[PDB]
Amino acid sequence: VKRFFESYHEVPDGTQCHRKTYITTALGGICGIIGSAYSVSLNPADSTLEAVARVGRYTFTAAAIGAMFGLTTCVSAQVREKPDDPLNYFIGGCAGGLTLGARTHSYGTAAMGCVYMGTAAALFKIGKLEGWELFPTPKV
Amino acid sequence: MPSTFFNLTMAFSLSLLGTLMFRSHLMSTLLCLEGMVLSLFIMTSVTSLNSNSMSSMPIPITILVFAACEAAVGLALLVKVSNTYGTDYVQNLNLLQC
Amino acid sequence: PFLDIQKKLGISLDRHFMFLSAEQPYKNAARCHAFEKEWIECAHGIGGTRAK
Amino acid sequence: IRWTYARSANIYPNFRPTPKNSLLGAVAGFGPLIFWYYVFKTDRDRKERLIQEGKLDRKFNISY
Amino acid sequence: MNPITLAIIYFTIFLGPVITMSSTNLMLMWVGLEFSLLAIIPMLINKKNPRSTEAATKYFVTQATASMIILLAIVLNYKQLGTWMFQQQTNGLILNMTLMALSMKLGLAPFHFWLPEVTQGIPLHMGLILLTWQKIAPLSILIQIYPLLNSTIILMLAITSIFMGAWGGLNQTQMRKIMAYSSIAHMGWMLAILPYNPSLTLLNLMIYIILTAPMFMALMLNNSMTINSISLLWNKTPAMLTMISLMLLSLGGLPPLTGFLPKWIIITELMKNNCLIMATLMAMMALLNLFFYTRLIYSTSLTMFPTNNNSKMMTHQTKTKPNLMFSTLAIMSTMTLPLAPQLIT
Amino acid sequence: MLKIILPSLMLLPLTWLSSPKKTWTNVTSYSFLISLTSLTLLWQTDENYKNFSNMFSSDPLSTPLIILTAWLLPLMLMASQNHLKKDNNVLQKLYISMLISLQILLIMTFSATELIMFYILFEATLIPTLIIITRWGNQTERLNAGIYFLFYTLIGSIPLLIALILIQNHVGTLNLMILSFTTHTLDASWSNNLLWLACMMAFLIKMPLYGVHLWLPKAHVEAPIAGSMILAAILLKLGSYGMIRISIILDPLTKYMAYPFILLSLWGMIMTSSICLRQTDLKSLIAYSSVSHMALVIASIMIQTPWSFMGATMLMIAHGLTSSLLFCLANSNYERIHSRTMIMARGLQMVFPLMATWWLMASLANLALPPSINLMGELFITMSLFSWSNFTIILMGINIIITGMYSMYMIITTQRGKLTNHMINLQPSHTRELTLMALHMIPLILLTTSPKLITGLTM
Amino acid sequence: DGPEKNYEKTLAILQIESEKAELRLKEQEVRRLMRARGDGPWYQFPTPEKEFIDHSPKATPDN
Amino acid sequence: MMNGRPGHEPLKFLPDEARSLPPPKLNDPRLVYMGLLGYCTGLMDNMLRMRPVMRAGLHRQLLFVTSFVFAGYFYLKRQNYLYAVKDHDMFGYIKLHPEDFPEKEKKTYAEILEPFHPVR
Amino acid sequence: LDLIWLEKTIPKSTSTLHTNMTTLTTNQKGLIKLYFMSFLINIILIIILYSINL
Ligand SMILES: CCCCCCCCCCCCCCCCCC(=O)OC[C@H](COP(=O)([O-])OCC[N+](C)(C)C)OC(=O)CCCCCCCCCCCCCCCCC
Ligand SMILES: CCCCCCCCCCCCCCCCCC(=O)OC[C@H](COP(=O)(O)OCCN)OC(=O)CCCCCCCCCCCCCCCCC
Residue F418 — φ and ψ, nearest 5°? -70, 145
Q: What is the DSSP string of F226-267?
A: HHHHHIIIIIHHHHHHHHHHHGGGGTTTHHHHTHHHHHHHHH
When computed from its CA atoms, the radius of gyration of chain B, rounded to whole angstroms, is: 17
DSSP 8-state class, residue E197: -
Please name the residue whose Cα sits nearest to atom 49 of ligand 2. Answer: E281
Which among F247, F245, F241, F206 has a CA at the least distance from the CA of F64? F241
Which among E196, E293, E217, E296 has a CA at the least distance from the CA of E253? E293
Cis check for the bond before F371: say yes or no (omega within 30 of 0).
yes
Distance (Å, rounded) from C-alpha F450 to C-alpha F440?
A: 16
Touching C (3+ Cβ pairs <8 A), the chains are B, E, G, H
Distance (Å, rounded) from C-alpha F89 to C-alpha I32?
A: 54
Q: Which residues contact E234 (CB under 8 A, 6 or more apart)?
A: E241, E301, E304, E305, E307
Q: What is the DSSP string of B19-72?
A: HHS--SBHHHHHHHHHHHHHHHHHHHHHHHHHHT-TTTTHHHHHHHHHHHHHHH
Q: Contact I37/B21, CB-based, under 8 Å?
A: yes
Burial class of A133 by CB neighbour count within 10 A (0 to 12, 13 to 18, 19+): middle
Burial class of A139 by CB neighbour count within 10 A (0 to 12, 13 to 18, 19+): middle
Distance (Å, rounded) from C-alpha H93 to C-alpha H40?
A: 44
E139–chain F nearest CA distance, Å: 27
Domain count, chain I: 1
Q: Are E102 and E161 in contact (CB under 8 A)?
A: no
Index of the ligand 2 atom closest to the CA of residue F264: 1
3-state secondary structure I1-54: CCCCHHHHHCHHHHHHHHHHHHHHHCCCCCCHHHHHHHHHHHHHHHHHHHHHHC
Q: Contact G45/E85, CB-based, under 8 Å?
A: no
Q: Do chains H and I touch (3 or more CB pairs under 8 A)?
A: no
Q: Which amino acid does the sequence have at E293?
A: Y
Q: Which amino acid does the sequence have at E316?
A: H
Distance (Å, rounded) from C-alpha F132 to C-alpha F225?
A: 10
What are the distances in angstroms from CA A85 to CA F193, F197, F446? 14, 18, 55
- Three-state DSSP at E193 gives helix
DSSP 8-state class, residue E84: S
Burial class of B25 by CB neighbour count within 10 A (0 to 12, 13 to 18, 19+): middle
Residues with CB under 6 A from ligand 1: A 123, 130-132; E 276-277, 280, 284; F 155-156, 159, 162-163, 166, 191, 194-195, 197-198, 201, 205; I 10, 14
DSSP 8-state class, residue B91: G
DSSP 8-state class, residue A137: P
Q: Contact G46/E83, CB-based, under 8 Å?
A: no
Q: Which conformational region is residue G12 in: left (phi greater than 0), alpha (psi within -120 to 50 degrees), or beta?
A: alpha
Burial class of H33 by CB neighbour count within 10 A (0 to 12, 13 to 18, 19+): middle
Distance (Å, rounded) from C-alpha F379 to C-alpha F388?
A: 14
Q: Which residues contact B80 (CB under 8 A, 6 or more apart)?
A: E45, E53, E56, E57
Give H-chain residues touching D51 at CB under 8 angstroms: 120
Q: Contact I7/F148, CB-based, under 8 Å?
A: no
Distance (Å, rounded) from C-alpha B1 to C-alpha F242?
A: 70
Q: Considering every ligand atom shown, identify the ligand nearest to the alpha carbon of residue E272 and give its number.
A: 1
Asked: is B2-98 a CATH 3.10.310.10 domain? The reply is no
F147–chain E nearest CA distance, Å: 8
What are the distances in angstroms from CA H17 to CA E341, H8, H13? 21, 11, 12
When computed from its CA atoms, the radius of gyration of chain D, rounded to whole angstroms, is: 23
Residue F427 — φ and ψ, nearest 5°? -65, 145
Which of F158, F214, F281 best probes binding to I when mutated, by most I CB atoms within 10 angstroms? F214
Q: Contact H117/F255, CB-based, under 8 Å?
A: yes
Give F-chain residues touching E267 at CB under 8 angstroms: 161-162, 165
Give G-chain residues touching H6 at CB under 8 angstroms: 41
Distance (Å, rounded) from C-alpha C25 to C-alpha I33?
A: 47
Q: Which residues contact F345 (CB under 8 A, 6 or more apart)?
A: F333, F336, F337, F339, F414, F420, F423
Residue ranges of alpha helices (H) inside chain E are 3-22, 26-44, 50-81, 92-106, 115-119, 124-128, 136-144, 151-171, 175-193, 198-222, 227-231, 233-236, 241-252, 260-272, 276-297, 311-316, 325-334, 340-343
**Is some CB atom of chain E closer than 8 A to the CB atom of C19?**
yes
Distance (Å, rounded) from C-alpha F17 to C-alpha F39?
A: 27
H34–chain C nearest CA distance, Å: 28
Q: In angstroms, how far apart are the furthest CA atoms of chain C?
A: 36
Q: Contact A43/I29, CB-based, under 8 Å?
A: yes
Distance (Å, rounded) from C-alpha F125 to C-alpha E3?
A: 51
Task: Report the separation in Å between the CA atom of I8 and the middle of ligand 2, taken as the mean of its atom positions.
Answer: 11
Report the chain I residue with the minimal C-alpha distance to residue E169: I22
Residue F58 — φ and ψ, nearest 5°? -115, 150
Q: Which residues contact E16 (CB under 8 A, 6 or more apart)?
A: E32, E33, E34, E35, E36, E37, E39, E137
CA atoms within 13 A on the CB side of I46: 29
Burial class of E313 by CB neighbour count within 10 A (0 to 12, 13 to 18, 19+): exposed
**Residues in chain A followed by a break, C to N above 2.5 angstroms:** none
What are the distances in angstroms from CA H31 to CA E329, E331, H24, H96, I33? 18, 15, 9, 37, 55
Which among F139, F305, F131 has a CA at the least distance from the CA of F222? F139
F143, F147, F158: which to mutate for ligand 2, most atoms within 8 A of CB? F147
Q: Which amino acid does the sequence have at F387?
A: S
Count of CB atoms situated within 10 Å of the CB of H14: 14
Task: Report the separation in Å between the CA atom of A24 and the middle of ligand 1, taken as the mean of its atom positions.
Answer: 24
Distance (Å, rounded) from C-alpha D22 to C-alpha D32?
A: 16
Which of F31-35's residues contact partners 24+ apart within 8 Å by CB, and which partners? F31/F70, F31/F73, F31/F74, F31/F77, F31/F100, F31/F103, F32/F74, F33/F7, F34/F4, F34/F7, F34/F8, F34/F70, F34/F73, F34/F103, F35/F67, F35/F70, F35/F71, F35/F73, F35/F74
G4–chain H nearest CA distance, Å: 26
Count of CB atoms situated within 10 Å of the CB of B9: 16
Please name the residue whose Cα sits nearest to atom 42 of ligand 2. Answer: E288
Q: Which residues contact F64 (CB under 8 A, 6 or more apart)?
A: F313, F316, F317, F453, F454
**Is some CB atom of chain G closer than 8 A to the CB atom of C23?**
yes
Please name the residue whose Cα sits nearest to atom 1 of ligand 2. Answer: F211
Distance (Å, rounded) from C-alpha A10 to C-alpha H83?
A: 49
Q: Which amino acid does the sequence have at F269?
A: M
Give I-chain residues touching E92 at CB under 8 angstroms: 50, 54
Facing residue for D64 by CB, picked from F211, F260, F305: F305
Q: Contact F214/I1, CB-based, under 8 Å?
A: no
Q: Contact C8/H11, CB-based, under 8 Å?
A: yes
Residue H58 — φ and ψ, nearest 5°? -65, -35
- Three-state DSSP at F406 gives helix
Q: Are F2 and F80 in contact (CB under 8 A)?
A: no
Three-point CA angle E177, I16, F136, nearest 5°: 75
Task: Report the separation in Å between the CA atom of A134 and the middle of ligand 1, taken as the mean of its atom positions.
Answer: 13
Distance (Å, rounded) from C-alpha A87 to C-alpha F107?
A: 44
What are the distances in angstroms from CA E342 to CA F193, H19, H75, H83? 36, 18, 8, 10
A124, A129, A130: which to mutate for ligand 1, most atoms within 8 A of CB? A130
Touching A (3+ Cβ pairs <8 A), the chains are E, F, G, I
Count of CB atoms situated within 10 Å of the CB of F185: 15
- Three-state DSSP at F7 gives helix
Query: Residue ranges of the domains in chain B?
Result: 2-98
Distance (Å, rounded) from C-alpha F91 to C-alpha F18?
A: 14
Distance (Å, rounded) from C-alpha C37 to C-alpha G63?
A: 10
Q: What is the DSSP string of A34-69?
A: HHHHHHHHHS--SSHHHHHHHHHHHHHHHHHHHHHH
Task: Report the separation in Å between the CA atom of E286 and the middle of ligand 2, taken as the mean of its atom positions.
Answer: 13
Query: Residue ranges of the domains in chain E?
Result: 2-344
3-state secondary structure F88-141: CHHHHHHHHHHHHHHHHHHHHHHHECEHHHHHHHHHHHHHHHHHHHHHHCCCCC
Distance (Å, rounded) from C-alpha F78 to C-alpha F71?
A: 12
Give helix D19-52 / helix F259-277 axis angle, nearest 10°.
Answer: 130
What are the distances in angstroms from CA F262 to CA B49, D48, F244, F409? 79, 18, 15, 28
Q: Are F373 and F454 in contact (CB under 8 A)?
A: yes
Parent domain of I28 = 1-54
Residues with CB under 6 A from ligand 2: E 281, 284, 287-288, 291; F 144, 147-148, 151-152, 155, 211-212; I 10-11, 14-15, 18-19
Burial class of D2 by CB neighbour count within 10 A (0 to 12, 13 to 18, 19+): exposed
Distance (Å, rounded) from C-alpha I38 to C-alpha E111?
A: 8
Length of chain D equals 64
Index of the ligand 1 atom closest to the CA of residue E280: 42
Index of the ligand 1 atom closest to the CA of residue E274: 27
Entry resolution (Å): 3.0
DSSP 8-state class, residue B89: B
Experiment type:
cryo-EM
- Range 2-21 of G in CB contact (< 8 A) with A: none
Burial class of B31 by CB neighbour count within 10 A (0 to 12, 13 to 18, 19+): middle
- Strand-pair partners of D6: none
Burial class of E20 by CB neighbour count within 10 A (0 to 12, 13 to 18, 19+): buried
Which of G35, G37, G45 best probes binding to A when mutated, by most A CB atoms within 10 angstroms? G35
Q: Which amino acid does the sequence have at E319?
A: K
Count of CB atoms situated within 10 Å of the CB of E253: 24
**Is some CB atom of chain E closer than 8 A to the CB atom of B59?**
yes
Distance (Å, rounded) from C-alpha F301 to C-alpha F307?
A: 10
Distance (Å, rounded) from C-alpha F280 to C-alpha F282?
A: 7
What are the distances in angstroms from CA A32 to CA A55, A56, I23? 8, 9, 20
Distance (Å, rounded) from C-alpha C51 to C-alpha C44?
A: 8
- Three-state DSSP at F382 gives helix
Report the chain C residue with the minimal C-alpha distance to residue B51: C31
Three-point CA angle F68, G5, G23, nearest 5°: 90
Query: Residue ranges of the domains in chain F?
Result: 2-459
What are the distances in angstroms from CA D44 to CA D34, D36, F250, F308? 15, 12, 21, 17
- Range 1-54 of I in CB contact (< 8 A) with D: 1, 3-8, 12
Distance (Å, rounded) from C-alpha B38 to C-alpha B44?
A: 10
Distance (Å, rounded) from C-alpha E46 to C-alpha E122?
A: 9
Task: Report the separation in Å between the CA atom of F159 and the middle of ligand 1, taken as the mean of its atom positions.
Answer: 7
Index of the ligand 2 atom closest to the CA of residue E295: 26
* Start-to-end Cα distance in chain G: 83
Distance (Å, rounded) from C-alpha D41 to C-alpha D38?
A: 5
Cis check for the bond before E341: say yes or no (omega within 30 of 0).
no
Distance (Å, rounded) from C-alpha F282 to C-alpha F339?
A: 10
Give helix F282-303 / helix F306-337 axis angle, nearest 10°.
Answer: 170
Which among F289, F124, F325, F307 has a CA at the least distance from the CA of F216? F289
When computed from its CA atoms, the radius of gyration of chain I, rounded to whole angstroms, is: 19
Give F-chain residues touching H114 at CB under 8 angstroms: 185
**Is some CB atom of chain A closer than 8 A to the CB atom of E158?**
no
Residue H109 — φ and ψ, nearest 5°? -90, 50
Q: Contact F214/I7, CB-based, under 8 Å?
A: yes
CA atoms within 13 A on the CB side of B14: 9
